[PDB]
Amino acid sequence: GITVLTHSELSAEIGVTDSIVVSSELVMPYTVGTWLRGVAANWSKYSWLSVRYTYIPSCPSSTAGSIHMGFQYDMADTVPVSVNQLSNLRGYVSGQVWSGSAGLCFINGTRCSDTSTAISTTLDVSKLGKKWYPYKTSADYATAVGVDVNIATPLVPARLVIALLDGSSSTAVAAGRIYCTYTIQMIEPTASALNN
Amino acid sequence: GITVLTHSELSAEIGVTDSIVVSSELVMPYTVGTWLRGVAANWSKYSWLSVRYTYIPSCPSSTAGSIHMGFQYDMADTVPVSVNQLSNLRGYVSGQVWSGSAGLCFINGTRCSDTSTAISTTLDVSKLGKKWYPYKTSADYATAVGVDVNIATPLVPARLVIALLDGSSSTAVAAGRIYCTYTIQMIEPTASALNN
Amino acid sequence: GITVLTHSELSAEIGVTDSIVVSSELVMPYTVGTWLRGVAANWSKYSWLSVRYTYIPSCPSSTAGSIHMGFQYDMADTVPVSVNQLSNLRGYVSGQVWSGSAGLCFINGTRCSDTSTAISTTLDVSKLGKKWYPYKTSADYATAVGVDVNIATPLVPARLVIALLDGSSSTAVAAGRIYCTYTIQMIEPTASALNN
Amino acid sequence: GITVLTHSELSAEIGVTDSIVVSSELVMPYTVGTWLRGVAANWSKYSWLSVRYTYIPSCPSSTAGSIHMGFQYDMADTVPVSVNQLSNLRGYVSGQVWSGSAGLCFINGTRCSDTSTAISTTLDVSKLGKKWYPYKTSADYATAVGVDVNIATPLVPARLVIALLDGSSSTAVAAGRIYCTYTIQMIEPTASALNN
Amino acid sequence: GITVLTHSELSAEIGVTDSIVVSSELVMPYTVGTWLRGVAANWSKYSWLSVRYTYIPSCPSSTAGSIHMGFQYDMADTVPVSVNQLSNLRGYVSGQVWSGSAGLCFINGTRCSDTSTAISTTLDVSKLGKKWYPYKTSADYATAVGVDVNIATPLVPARLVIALLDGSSSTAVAAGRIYCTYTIQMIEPTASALNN
Amino acid sequence: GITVLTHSELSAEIGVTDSIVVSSELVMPYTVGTWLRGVAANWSKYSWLSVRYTYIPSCPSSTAGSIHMGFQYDMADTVPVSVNQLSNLRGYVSGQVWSGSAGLCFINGTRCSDTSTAISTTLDVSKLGKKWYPYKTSADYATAVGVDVNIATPLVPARLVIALLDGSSSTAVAAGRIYCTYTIQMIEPTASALNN
Ligand SMILES: [Ca+2]
Ligand SMILES: [Ca+2]
Ligand SMILES: [Ca+2]
Ligand SMILES: [Ca+2]
Numbered sequence A, B, C, D, E, F: 001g002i003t004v005l006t007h008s009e010l011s012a013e014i015g016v017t018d019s020i021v022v023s024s025e026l027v028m029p030y031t032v033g034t035w036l037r038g039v040a041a042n043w044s045k046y047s048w049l050s051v052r053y054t055y056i057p058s059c060p061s062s063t064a065g066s067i068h069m070g071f072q073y074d075m076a077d078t079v080p081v082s083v084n085q086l087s088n089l090r091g092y093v094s095g096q097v098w099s100g101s102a103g104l105c106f107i108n109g110t111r112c113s114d115t116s117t118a119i120s121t122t123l124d125v126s127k128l129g130k131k132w133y134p135y136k137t138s139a140d141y142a143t144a145v146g147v148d149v150n151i152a153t154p155l156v157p158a159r160l161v162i163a164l165l166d167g168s169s170s171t172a173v174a175a176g177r178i179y180c181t182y183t184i185q186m187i188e189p190t191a192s193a194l195n196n
C-alpha cells in the first residue's frame, strides 16, 4: 500500500545581513515545499525514508556571509540564538554563503565524489520519534501547538534551524537557496480536500 | 507478558434510507464492542495484530440500499461526505445492503474460499502510527479531543467511516450489522477501575 | 524516477432505463476519477501498468436491467450503438444490473476465487499504442480532438464504452456504480499548475 | 549517533508509617535522579534500554513496615489506592521494609545469584509506547498535562507507583531508599540551556 | 541500419540580468545545434541514446547571477515562470553563473570524478514517449504546433527550460554557454533536401 | 489476444513511359490491398511483423524501362523527384522492368536461393515509430493530413515511393505489378462498420 517517491524541490530563498538571523522550518510534507505539499496531501500518513536540506549559492565569490543549519526534535525546546548553540545540534553544517556548489550532486540524484564542500545535511529518520506521521496543514498544526507545544511531537519529526550572519550589509543580500531532497513513503490515500 | 486474544463480536446495527448517512467509529478496544471493552480494560496498553469489520445482511434480496466502509487515520481530517470521497479511502469496500453473507467465513474463524462477495475490510496494523496504544474510555478520549483533536493520534490508531444510501424509504430500514473480528495483544495489567 | 501507485476509486454512477443508452469515457488519469486526477497532475507523463473497471450493484435482486462494457482504441472509430456491436469489443463483459458483487475482490486488492460472476474488465496495457502517455486535462484534450480526432491517439490509450438497457422504467433507476482500480507509474514531476 | 550509558543513582528516600501512603514518579531522565537529569539534558531525545528501580534498606531487622512497587503506562489512569490494586500492576514487587539487601547486586552492576529476596523491578522497555522519547523538564511536562493528561503519553513511557504501610509509627520512619539503575541511549545533542 | 554518433557542440550563449528570464528549447536534432542539425537531416528518423545539456562559465568569480535548467515533456504544458516551479522539474539543476567548470569532463568525453559541481543535466531517454522520432525542421514543426500544440508530442521528446536571474545588471551580462553532448542513432537515410 | 496472419496479395499494376513518374503508397492495412483492407478492418489496431513489396514482370525481355522503390517515414518529408534522390532511400531497389521473376519465391512463401535478381524490398518494422498502429481508412486519414501532415506519423508507419522511367513509349506500357507480402498481428476486434 506504500507509494514511494524520491524528489528534490526548492525549499527556501536565502539572504544575508551583518547581524545573525535565526529561523526554522518544520520537516513535514506540507512545509518542505509547494510540490510535495500538494502531492502528499492526497495520502493520510507518510514516512521519511530520507530527507536532506542542501544549500546552493547564487552569489559571487566576493559575497560576505555564512550559513548554518541543524536539527531539533522537541519542538518545545527553545530555538538556538547563536552559532555556538546551533553548532551543538545534530547534523550541524556551516559554510561560506558563496560556497556549497558541490551540493548539486545530491539534488540531481546523480552519484558524485567531491562532496566535502557541500553545505547539505540529512535527517536521522531511524531515530525519529516514530516512523509514520500524519499529514498536517500548517493551519491545523498551528492551532494545536497553540494549545500546547508538546501536542506537536506526535505530529512532526523535527525542525531545521537556520542561521545567517557575517554579511556585509544590514540589508538582506540574496546569497542562494535551500533545496529539499526527499524519499517519502505515502500511505492510506484520502480525498485531499479532507486532509487537515 | 503478552496476552493474545482472537475473537469476533457485534459492533453495530445497520439501517438504510434514501439519503446518504455517514458515520464513523474509533478503532479501539473500548469502542469496537461491549465484550472487548470489558476485557481490554483490565490491561494498561494493547496492540492490534488484526482488526476487521465485516458486514452481514439480515434483510431480503429485494431490499434497496448499499453500504460503504473505509478507514481514516488522522482524526483531525474531516469525515467524508460522499461515496466518491469515501471511495478514495484505504480499505474501501462497497456492496448491496442484502449482500455480504460470505463474510461469515471470517467471523467464524473458519477457513473459506468464496470470499469475493464479502463486505469485509481489514486494518493496516503494520502502518498504524505506533504498535502499542493505551486503553482509553470514550469519556476520557472525548475530553482530550475536546482540548484539541490532534491529542488523539497518540491515543487511537484509526477510525472506520461508514456510509449508507440507495435505500427505498426515508425511514431507516434494518439491513444488517457490522461485526468486528480482532486478534489483540493486551499488556501491563491494571485494576480495571483505574483504567481511563 | 518512477513513482508507482496502486489504488481503487469511484469512477461513475450507473442508472438503468428501458431503452439502450451508450456512453464512453477516456482511460486517462484525468478522467478515471477525481483522486487520481489530482495526484497524477503533479507528474508530466505516466503509464498504465494495470487498469480495470469493475461494476458493483446497489439495487435489489428484483431490479430489471443489464450493463455492458468494452474497450475502443482508435478514438476516431465511431462508438457502438448496440449490444451486438459492443459485444465484438475487446474485454466485453455483460451482466444483470444487480449482479457483480464478486467484483469487490478486485477493488479491495484482496486475493479471491469466486470471480466468475464479476462484471469487471481489464485493459491491454501491453498492446496500447505506446507505454508512456502525457497527462492531459479534458479541456486541452477537447480542444485538440476539436481540430481533428486523430490528434488524440498520441494523447490517450483507449476509451471504455458502456451500454445500459433492459430496465423497467423509462426514467433512470440507480443500479450501481463503476469503480476504477489501477496501478500507474508516474514520471517527470511538474508543478501541477502548469500541467495541461 | 547513539551515546549509550549505564549507571545507578539514588532516586528516592523511603520512610514508613502505620497508614498506607501511595506515591508515584515519572520514568524519564529528568525525574529518575539529579545526575542523569543533568547529563541527559544535553541530548534532544533518548531511549530506555533498561530501567530498574531497586529498594535498599537502612533500618534494623526489627523495623515494622512493607514497601510495594509497580508500573503504570497511561498517565490518565488513576493511581492505585490500595495494595490490592497495586498488586495487579506490571512488575509488582513487595517486601519487608528491612529486606531487599540482595538488590545491591544490580546497583553494583556485579553479576550475582541470591536475588530472590531483591525488592527490585524492571521496565518493559520493548512494550513502551515508542522507543525514542523527548527529554522533558518537569516544569514543561507539568504545563502540558495541565492542559490535558493524555498530552503526556507521547512525552513519557511510564510511572512507578510506590506504596508504604504496615509501619509501627504514625510518623514517618526512615526505612531505606530506592535507587535507579539504567542503560540509556541519548541522541541528537543540544545546548542544555535550550532543552525544555 | 543504425548509424550511431556521439558528439558535443555549442547549443546556446548565456547572459544574466537582475530579473528572471525563462526560455526553452526543443530537444531535437534540428535545434540542439548547427552541426547535428546538418548531419541528422540526412536521415529520416533518429533516437536519443543520451542527451545532456551542460553549462560552462566564461565570467569572473565575482559575477552575480545563477542559472537553472529542467525538462518538460508535454509541450502543451505551460512553461515555468519561477525558480520554484522550475525546481519541481525532472533533472533540475541550479548553480552560480560562474560555477560549472567541472562540466567540461562530460563535453570532453573524458572520464572524471570531481563532477559534483557540474551544472549539467541528462534526459530520461528510456522514459520518452517513444524511441524513434522523425527529423523535423523548426519551420515544419512550428506550423504543426500552430494548428495545435499536442500535434507536437509525436514529433519531439522534450524541451529544456532555462532560467537566469540574480544578476547585478538589468542589461544582459555574458555569463557562459550551454553545450549539448549527445549519442544519437540515425536511421533510414534520405536526401537532405527532402527532409522537413 | 493477437491474431497473426501471413499472406500475399496484389498491391498495384505497373506501367512504363519514357519520362519518370514518381508515385507513393501508404504502408497500412487499408492501402496495401483490397483483401487485407477488408480483413484488418475487423480489428482496432495492428502491427507489421513483416511487410515486403515485391515487383513481378509480365512484359517481354525486349521491354524498355526500369522500376525503382524505396521507403520514407516522415510523411511531411517531400517525395523524391529523381532516381538519384530515391536511391538514397532505405531499402532502395532498382531493376529492369522485365526482370524480377525470382521475387516469386517470396510471394509463394516458398524457401528459395536465386534471389539476387529479385526486385523486392522489406520494411524496418523494428525501427518504425511505434509497434501498434490504429487501422485507418484512407478517407479518415486524408482528412487528418488535411489539417496537418504531421498528424499522420502516429497513424501510419511509412510510405513506399515508386519511380518508373527509361521506357520506350510516352504512353504507359504495362510492365508488371507489385504484390505485397505481409505477416500482420491484429488486435482488439471491433465491428467493422465502426472502424474509421
Ligand atoms: Ca491529516
Ligand atoms: Ca488507560
Ligand atoms: Ca500535460
Ligand atoms: Ca526537550
Ligand SMILES: [Ca+2]
Pocket (backbone or CB within 6 Å): E044, E134, E135, E136, E195, E196, F074, F076, F077
Ligand atoms: Ca522529416
Ligand SMILES: [Ca+2]
Pocket (backbone or CB within 6 Å): C074, C076, C077, F044, F134, F135, F136, F195, F196
Ligand atoms: Ca480505426
